[model samples]
Target: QFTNVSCTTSKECWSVCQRLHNTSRGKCMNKKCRCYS
Candidate 1:
């Protein structure tokens, strides 16, 4: 499942999504990490 995980930078989302979601469509929005489902 996707989540609004807290993040500081786009790179943060990159790692987070790649690790958690197993996706590269990771983005940082409103200082949060968003993983594409």
Candidate 2:
């Protein structure tokens, strides 16, 4: 999931993806949250 956000860290992105997106596989790429299945 290329959910581009003004992200500062993968810490929050991972949590967000885990909670909202329902997937623990994710990371922050600069300002984007990269989620995977």
Candidate 3:
């Protein structure tokens, strides 16, 4: 699955996503983050 999340920084968002999903399957775009699994 893939979804978008609002966040301040890509690094912050990626770390958050990693904790949530337990993987490094995310990226930042236009102040938003995308997570894929």
Candidate 4:
């Protein structure tokens, strides 16, 4: 499932996404992050 995570910047968002999912399967949108797993 895909979920939303709040963040300040794309880089910071993706970093958090990678940590949670352990993969680069996510993106930043409007200062928010979405993670797919």
TM-score of each: 0.60, 0.58, 0.47, 0.44
Give me the runs in candidate 3 sitting further than 4 Å from their true place: 1-4
Per-residue lDDT over 1-37 for candidate 4, one digit per residue giving the tens place of the 0 to 100 score = 2446766665655667777777666666774677655
The Cα local distance difference test for each model comes to: 0.72, 0.73, 0.66, 0.64
Clashes by residue pair, model 1: none
Question: Which residue runs of candidate 4 sit more than 4 Å off their true CA positions?
Answer: 1-4
On lDDT, who's better, 1 or 4? 1
Comparison by TM-score, 1 against 2, better one = 1
Q: Supply the TM-score for candidate 3.
A: 0.47
Rank candidates, lDDT, best first: 2, 1, 3, 4
| Model 3 clashing residue pairs (backbone) | none
lDDT of candidate 1 over 1-37, digit per residue (tens): 3567888777777777778756877777785678775
Better of 2 and 4 by TM-score: 2
lDDT (Cα, tens digit) per residue for candidate 3, span 1-37: 3445776666756676778877776666775777655
Q: lDDT tens string, model 2, 1-37? A: 8775557766766777777777887777776777776
The window of 10 residues in a row where model 2 has the poorest summed lDDT is 4-13
Task: Please say which candidate is ahead in TM-score: 2 or 3.
Answer: 2
**What TM-score does prediction 4 earn?**
0.44
| Top TM-score hit | 1
